[PDB]
Design a protein around this ligand. Structure first.
Ligand SMILES: O=c1ccn([C@@H]2O[C@H](COP(=O)(O)OP(=O)(O)OP(=O)(O)O)[C@@H](O)[C@H]2O)c(=O)[nH]1
Ligand SMILES: O=c1ccn([C@@H]2O[C@H](COP(=O)(O)OP(=O)(O)OP(=O)(O)O)[C@@H](O)[C@H]2O)c(=O)[nH]1
Ligand SMILES: O=c1ccn([C@@H]2O[C@H](COP(=O)(O)OP(=O)(O)OP(=O)(O)O)[C@@H](O)[C@H]2O)c(=O)[nH]1
Ligand SMILES: O=c1ccn([C@@H]2O[C@H](COP(=O)(O)OP(=O)(O)OP(=O)(O)O)[C@@H](O)[C@H]2O)c(=O)[nH]1
Ligand SMILES: O=c1ccn([C@@H]2O[C@H](COP(=O)(O)OP(=O)(O)O)[C@@H](O)[C@H]2O)c(=O)[nH]1
Ligand SMILES: O=c1ccn([C@@H]2O[C@H](COP(=O)(O)OP(=O)(O)O)[C@@H](O)[C@H]2O)c(=O)[nH]1
Ligand SMILES: O=c1ccn([C@@H]2O[C@H](COP(=O)(O)OP(=O)(O)O)[C@@H](O)[C@H]2O)c(=O)[nH]1
Ligand SMILES: O=c1ccn([C@@H]2O[C@H](COP(=O)(O)OP(=O)(O)O)[C@@H](O)[C@H]2O)c(=O)[nH]1
Ligand SMILES: O=c1ccn([C@@H]2O[C@H](COP(=O)(O)OP(=O)(O)O)[C@@H](O)[C@H]2O)c(=O)[nH]1
Ligand SMILES: O=c1ccn([C@@H]2O[C@H](COP(=O)(O)OP(=O)(O)O)[C@@H](O)[C@H]2O)c(=O)[nH]1
Lengths: 159, 229, 229, 229, 229, 159
């Protein structure tokens, strides 16, 4: 019955609604759901994707380098992470965004010990930038994060 | 007559085609123009915008916080910078991308002296992430970067052939910063234009889409609008 | 009532006493004032200026390059920041120094989220190196830092009792940004004032040297000049 | 005959003229001397001091913490390094500035192999921030840098004509490290002199202000004091 | 009576057992001693040596260049630091390793303020790569690090119970720096001892192998040799 | 007949002679051989190991972390690279040492374009620090370097 540590897999559709970009309504309602579950006394780590901006397969079909395409996708994931952080902060929630790409001015570097400390402090963890390396999927990143931070359950958003 | 160091300011429309996202054809033609002007033998620093992804004021009035909105806009600027770098390097042009927000795995940090050296080595110096500070714009980013790298001119690449007396109109040719302020034209943002006028930096608003326009402007042909002093 | 988050702005006079170098007495006075304000329970970010060492415009007038002059001025700001950190640690106040120019061994890189967390934890957050870019100034640095951290007010520390109608003879009390622009008053430079007006950050110009003035201003007493929206 | 690789050592007097701050005339004289030496075909690494701004020992005597005082002094050395770089670029000499404290935007991190390569390529290699560690001094910095890059001589630039037997009255010509230690002469501080003696690096103390003295010393003429093995 | 901040200098013998390489048992017992003294409630910075791998003077007299010899020695120091960190963390002790030679993937860079914060957080601050500069030793590295982090004492961990009047002899108890210089004892290298004496840093030479010796020295029990002033 | 770009795989035995440490005689004679082949008009990239100092299997058997053990091994490889660079410089050869671990004060970061430029300039390339990541072998690093820098032949030293 229930869980204590949940990793929520959010995709670009959860931030775009099908259209390319950012739709404040969908992100606001998913932030409301996360607020409900976190006030229900659960620890939440949300791993965020960037399909609403870019995908490596589509950029390779357009004819760009795989490494550059994956870095652009990770940047899109970080943008979605910032948007979700803002919408969660609008509901009185303390959130910590960790990016696998070291961008200190934007967020904090990925550290599983810091992440589990934040989870134990009640803060909502937001894993962006994927795994920080090319040739990876956000589902693989979600599995790795769940295995590392000891998340007892993984739940994927659906449309 | 002629500019050796140009700072090409490319707004988000130059990557999105007026829409939201990335347009491969517009980026390809911009890359072709940049490659032509590089093979002409010019030192070019390209300041990227992110209006095709996000704007801080727009997101703030939508409801989001200005700081995170600005950081999302700067990340979109970095994405556009990466796209332009890929398209330029698809044509044999050596490009170095520098971001004012330190992201080592993505691009080298902002080193102005190394950027000047890259320019002297015949490389296109792409400037992303703006100035790395919220409550600012890519226009003042372009002004500051052009002033620091000692650029000869700031080439504002727009979809129109130049600035007009009133939005649809007469297309002006050569104006001054004081005249622009008096007439209330639209060359750049308030802070950007204030800095550019205080430091006496020549601006050249021109239509980049017309083939060879950037080459003519660099060679010194009287096209577009020249805001000088 | 009163301001919970203040961004103090200290100029080179607050570290040089009107001369070139460093006067320990003035820095000790500033440290005592900031210490009692912190003991009052206020979140405070200070922004340091380096006019007591170098001004980029003056060095450019002398003949040096503007970019190098600006970097020398920013290094002077970092030096004054370290001096203030020392004098504040003498008073048992925990301080965190952040420099816009990344120098990890000397201080930590500018991280606004870390700065606001340090403000929450009762630490004085000192800002050196300005904004890290040439052609700007510490007034623009103060405005941008206050906007980004979310500071309630910007406290301009001066040696005089606020903004006057005519520099030497009337002492103003409360005005607006538009009123200051119309009357041609001097609060900050053009870029900083434009940014502050566009974002509506309240400014309080007051004499820090007089004992208790900063505490009174934080509590909300009517002292100096209050430039509001 | 003569020295091919020299490590010039400039103190705060060479940038302040005996006062606090920066005197452009003395820096211009130093730049002219270094420029003509480089035009002579010599590899030169300069090491900058910051006594014209701050001394850690004096600040500790005043009451500040020694570590922070030393970091302020190193930042002052970096500022003087930037001033010298500007004045050398005014003379058309290519310079590379390396700071022991990593500040990538201002200069490049201290890389000895890069420094010797820059020396090979005809660039003056300027060293700021000392050795990057507190409690040391620019004399120790000069000794260590000369040992590491492989400089043939260490040229101590002073305002007097070399080392004297008694500070104000005899002017020495050539001595050894042991002779200097026995007679109690002043060339460098204890740590730098100990390191130099243990490694046998030749020292030449001479007046840089007099025109052509550094060129004569590089060619091999007998001027100033030569402390050899 | 008692030291709160200790800088434990561990020579290469403490990792090699007198041989060349790494001895797991000696490192394990050193880690046990450090863990005991940490659980005693002390702030400890451990400066590592690399004599069990290489010495610059030895390689120079063998024929290799001094600079590369010193860099190999510093890399061996970093390897010993990593081994000590692993053995300490095998016992539940939180250790932070800092190297004066920037190697991000191996260890965090040398940040003295962050190291002091780690000490205040009850973490063992390991110092590797010496001071990152050739023509220096881990003894002067230890002296400089202890002076900068404001350590209470420098604990020289040797295989003997203290310094003697002559190598095999009377074991001294409490001496001064001047007395050590006059008697020609062996506490540290020339430069290291000069710096330590000039800055008045207390040294404590003791046998680390004897269980509880470090704990007794920290608590203030009169063991080993205390070089004070 | 002959080659133009040769990748020489050197192991810790080539620097120790069986004993733990550094033996100047073996490294001096291998430097003499490299001098002969480079004056014969060949481009040489030498990938160096660190078995003379440490091995991941031995350190794991002793009971240390795999990541730390591999970093110590890479540091040993860098030390061997510095020794070989010194002994090659003793014979009037320009050598460039590239380490996969970014240690700017010691050497230059690994860049295949810079490496091939140095090879075309006649300088001898010295690949140390392996591939910069744990769980890799120096033979795997040699294969990767040969495939990247376009080395036409790979030759492994033998005892
Ligand atoms: O971190 C850094 C690196 C480099 N720089 C600055 O970059 C400029 C050159 O950056 P380079 O690395 O191009 O030096 P270089 O000109 O010597 O290049 P080569 O001759 O080897 O082709 C130099 O002026 C240096 O100070 C920095 O300011 N910071
Ligand atoms: O490099 C960094 C580190 C941290 N941060 C951001 O700074 C803010 C505070 O980072 P702190 O580490 O100062 O506070 P913390 O609450 O995150 O940890 P505790 O104090 O509870 O131990 C956090 O929101 C973090 O994401 C960065 O932006 N960059
Ligand atoms: O980060 C670095 C880069 C370079 N170096 C070392 O600096 C020395 C010179 O590095 P340079 O790049 O200045 O000279 P180069 O000869 O290596 O390249 P060209 O000038 O031929 O273009 C080389 O020996 C390199 O290994 C470092 O130690 N660290
Ligand atoms: O790059 C850096 C990072 C940190 N520092 C210096 O490290 C010291 C503390 O380093 P911390 O990162 O521990 O700051 P903190 O004390 O706020 O840690 P928490 O409260 O979040 O646990 C601060 O004094 C900072 O200036 C640097 O000097 N440079
Ligand atoms: O560790 C990671 C995380 C993300 N990505 C790239 O990020 C882009 C967008 O992420 P995804 O396609 O996984 O987003 P979703 O489909 O979950 O919205 C893709 O090109 C991925 O290759 C990557 O390469 N490595
Ligand atoms: O230095 C900078 C550059 C960009 N931005 C943010 O990124 C967005 C995109 O920049 P701009 O709007 O200047 O791009 P354009 O529409 O000219 O392409 C801006 O709205 C800001 O919110 C910023 O905050 N600081
Ligand atoms: O972002 C910044 C902030 C400051 N400065 C330099 O800082 C020096 C002194 O700062 P200011 O003139 O703002 O100091 P004040 O007059 O307030 O003492 C000037 O040379 C500026 O160029 C700079 O270059 N960039
Ligand atoms: O490695 C170094 C070199 C210099 N300095 C500081 O630099 C300042 C001025 O340097 P010096 O006293 O060597 O200058 P000079 O007397 O030669 O002008 C002093 O406060 C030193 O502490 C330092 O801390 N570490
Ligand atoms: O700051 C430092 C520390 C170490 N080393 C080199 O590393 C070797 C090992 O250090 P030491 O000889 O001081 O170690 P111990 O024998 O005391 O363990 C020295 O010989 C030097 O060549 C160096 O050059 N500078
Ligand atoms: O890319 C690399 C290169 C080396 N190593 C480690 O380096 C150590 C010594 O290297 P090796 O054992 O490959 O040396 P050799 O047997 O060639 O002398 C081993 O523990 C390897 O795991 C590693 O982990 N990754």
């Amino acid at each position: 019955s229930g869980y204590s540590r949940v990793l929520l897999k959010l995709g670009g559709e959860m931030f775009g609604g099908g259209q390319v970009g950012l739709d404040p309504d969908v992100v606001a309602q998913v932030a409301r759901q996360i607020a409900d579950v976190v006030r229900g006394g659960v620890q939440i780590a949300v791993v965020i994707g960037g399909g609403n901006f870019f995908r490596g397969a589509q950029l390779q079909q357009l004819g760009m380098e795989r490494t550059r395409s994956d870095y652009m996708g990770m940047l899109g994931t970080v943008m979605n992470s910032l948007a979700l952080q803002d919408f969660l902060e609008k509901e009185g929630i303390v959130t910590r965004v960790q990016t696998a790409i070291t961008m200190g001015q934007v967020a904090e570097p990925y550290l599983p010990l810091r992440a589990v400390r934040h989870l134990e402090k009640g803060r909502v963890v937001i894993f962006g930038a994927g795994m920080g390396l090319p040739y990876f999927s956000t589902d693989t990143t979600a599995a790795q994060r769940a295995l590392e931070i000891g998340a007892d359950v993984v739940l994927m958003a659906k449309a």
